[PDB]
Amino acid sequence: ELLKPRTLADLIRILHELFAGDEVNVEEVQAVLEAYESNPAEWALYAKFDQYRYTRNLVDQGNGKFNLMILCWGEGHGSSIHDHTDSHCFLKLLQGNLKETLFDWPDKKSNEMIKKSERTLRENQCAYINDSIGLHRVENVSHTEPAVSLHLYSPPFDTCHAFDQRTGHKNKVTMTFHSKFGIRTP
């Protein structure tokens, strides 16, 4: 029975219930993530920015079933065009706005990756992506407002691919956590 999360802590407890089994009800997970109303005090501990690029801050390891993390995007910070390593990926805005640009999987032949579509994800909205849907880029295009987002991936992954927009060529990337459970992890 899906109830509204009263706090981030409550959200985490609910997510543990929803991932207790071997499968994922994506619509239920998205609904509960959307239903949590971002409260900056509850996640300030995790909102550790870097001047030069976005940061990934681990919040919960989901008893192995998922990683829950907070990403902090300075003005002008964005991601590569990337995949999600055969995992479910949910993205909820906690602060600010992010531009999501969708791309198709490239063909073998080298070619410009043309954007399929784009949308602006606004505060408290939750997006969902997986490799069967396509690839995406996520960017804070604001000149004046930092953005903060809450990401859930299941199963957890720490490697993915970045795609060259000019050719479609992919390279393996390993991502690191800027912090874990509020502690900077250089």
Ligand X SMILES: N[C@@H](CCS)C(=O)O
Q: Shortest distance, CB of residue 71 to ligand X, whole angstroms?
A: 6
Chain residue whose CB lies nearest ligand X: 138
Q: Shortest distance, CB of residue 80 to ligand X, whole angstroms?
A: 9
| Nearest CA among 27, 128, 29, 15 for reference residue 65 | 15
Report the C-alpha gap between 24 and 85 in whole angstroms: 16
Q: Token digits for 149?
A: 């987002």
Q: Shortest distance, CB of residue 18 to ligand X, whole angstroms?
A: 20
Q: Is 136 annotated as a binding residue?
A: yes
**Among residues 10 and 164, whose Cβ is nearest to ligand X?**
164
Q: Shortest distance, CB of residue 173 to ligand X, whole angstroms?
A: 9
Q: Is 88 annotated as a binding residue?
A: no
| Nearest CA among 56, 86, 68, 91 for reference residue 176 | 56
Q: Shortest distance, CB of residue 81 to ligand X, whole angstroms?
A: 10
**Among residues 138 and 147, whose Cβ is nearest to ligand X?**
138
**Among residues 24 and 138, whose Cβ is nearest to ligand X?**
138
| Nearest CA among 24, 12, 177, 8 for reference residue 88 | 24
Report the C-alpha gap between 76 and 101 in whole angstroms: 15
CA contacts within 13 A on the Cβ side of 135 = 23
Binding site for ligand X (CB under 6 A): 56, 71, 79, 89, 91, 138, 151, 175
Report the C-alpha gap between 62 and 159 in whole angstroms: 18
Report the C-alpha gap between 145 and 170 in whole angstroms: 31
Report the C-alpha gap between 84 and 158 in whole angstroms: 10
**Among residues 42 and 78, whose Cβ is nearest to ligand X?**
78
Q: Is 84 annotated as a binding residue?
A: yes
**Among residues 110 and 181, whose Cβ is nearest to ligand X?**
181
* Residue 102: strand, helix, or coil: strand
Known binding-site residue numbers for Fe cation: 82, 84, 136
